């Protein structure tokens, strides 16, 4: 619920940590134009945990929502905001013709039409230098061989659906097994020992027996995997003791 | 950039040859309700031949 987001070339990233992620507050909003998660299901975020989750905010001309996706190309994808091929998150985009658009023309958004090289994923280029397209050294002024690379939008409500300003929110979270802080509204039970019971520490479901071994985990280490990448040892999120996950009889 | 198109039963087919296929000029046109390609990706037309 922000009145104005940032520009595409100057997209702002919001760091989230020590949170209780209840994504039910987002579903009651207006029907989004594109709610697609590339690594998970949108109804399963409330039952999982995330190590580092970042929220990006930027507004495009609407029809360019297809460019905010892994493996896409275009003016926004190659110059302003690029997504990696291994992206794991959700993309949220909705219409904002009533907020970020004016009948006389809203000129508070740029998209860096021209750039010398293609931008790498998760980078920000807010340089306002004159794009030297010709051979003569541009002296910082507009000329026949160098123009302003930062072009303004013509957002007006008179344009049909597709040219209106669309606010895009990219939630980039890390689901790798690691010490995390955001672990939803999942509540806790007690700690039984030496019995075949289920375990759900940070979304890792399964069945095993806790033995409280003597493995020495480092502060940045919480999960341990065997040869077959099966998690056989975990660090309790609450208590600093180490517990092994051995299969039952 | 045409004022009027043809009929459905009399759909006109326009042959295109000996040109430079720059589909980037089509994006700044009127917003389309459905831009769906069935053989390639719409952002890959600027890298292939026909």
């Amino acid at each position, epitope marked *: 619920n922000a009145t104005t987001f940032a520009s595409v070339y100057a997209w702002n990233r919001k760091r989230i940590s020590n949170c209780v992620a209840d994504y039910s507050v987002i579903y009651n909003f207006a029907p989004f134009f594109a709610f697609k998660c590339y690594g998970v299901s949108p109804t399963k975020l409330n039952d999982l945990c995330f190590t580092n989750v970042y929220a990006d905010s930027f507004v495009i001309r609407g029809n360019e929502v297809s460019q905010i996706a892994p493996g896409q190309t275009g003016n926004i994808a190659d110059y302003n905001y690029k997504l990696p091929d291994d992206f794991t998150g959700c993309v949220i985009a909705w219409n904002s013709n009533k907020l970020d658009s004016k*009948p006389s023309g809203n000129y508070n958004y740029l998209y860096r039409l021209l750039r010398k090289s293609k931008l790498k994923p998760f980078e920000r280029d807010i340089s306002t230098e004159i794009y030297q397209a010709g051979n003569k050294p541009c002296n910082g002024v507009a000329g026949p061989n160098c123009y302003s690379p930062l072009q303004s939008y013509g957002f*007006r409500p*008179t*344009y049909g659906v597709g040219h209106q300003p669309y606010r895009v929110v990219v939630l980039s979270f890390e689901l790798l097994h690691a010490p995390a802080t955001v672990c939803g509204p999942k509540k806790s039970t007690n700690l039984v020992k030496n019995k075949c019971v289920n375990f759900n520490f940070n979304g890792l479901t399964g069945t095993g027996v806790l033995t409280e071994s003597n493995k020495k985990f480092l502060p940045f280490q919480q999960f341990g995997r065997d040869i077959a990448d099966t998690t056989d040892a975990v660090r309790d999120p609450q208590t600093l003791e180490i517990l092994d996950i051995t299969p039952c009889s | 950039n045409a*004022t009027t198109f043809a009929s459905v039963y009399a759909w006109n087919r326009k042959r295109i040859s000996n040109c430079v296929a720059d589909y980037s000029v089509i994006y700044n046109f009127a917003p389309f309700f459905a831009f769906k390609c069935y053989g390639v990706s719409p952002t890959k037309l600027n890298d292939l031949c026909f």
Partner: nanobody, 121 residues
Framework: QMQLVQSGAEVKKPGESLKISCKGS????????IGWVRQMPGKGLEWMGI????????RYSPSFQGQVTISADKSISTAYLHWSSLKASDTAMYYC??????????????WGQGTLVTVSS
């Protein structure tokens, strides 16, 4: 009865703003494209642009993109033609036209009375 009435003659000087109008009545002023046509003394007709009363979809002439702006008021069914920084070559006869019940959308079957605009130092 359908008819287009325009404002009176406007005489100004170079470097002064001007906003003439042309009101249409007798028809539904929401679906008929309204445009303006320039006619210099002794020359032919020159089209500058058209507008849509429902939503302002302005299609300006390639020689009149930023040289002039066109607007309309749907509440009172009146179209406007705003100028900025007039020059000595802007003095000409300006008409307002609209599409008819038959033909293309830029046919301009109906016309106005015509507004005489003159500028001199």
């Amino acid at each position: 009865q359908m008819q287009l009435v325009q404002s009176g003659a406007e005489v100004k000087k170079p470097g002064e703003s001007l906003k003439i109008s042309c009101k249409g009545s007798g028809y539904t002023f929401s679906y008929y494209w309204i445009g303006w046509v320039r006619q210099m003394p002794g020359k032919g007709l020159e089209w500058m642009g058209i507008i849509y009363p429902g939503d302002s979809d302005t299609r300006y002439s390639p020689s009149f993109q930023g040289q002039v702006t066109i607007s309309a008021d749907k509440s009172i069914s009146t179209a406007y033609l705003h100028w900025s920084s007039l020059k000595a070559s802007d003095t000409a006869m300006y008409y307002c036209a609209r599409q008819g019940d038959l033909g293309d959308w830029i046919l301009l079957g109906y016309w106005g009375q015509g507004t005489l605009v003159t500028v001199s130092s």
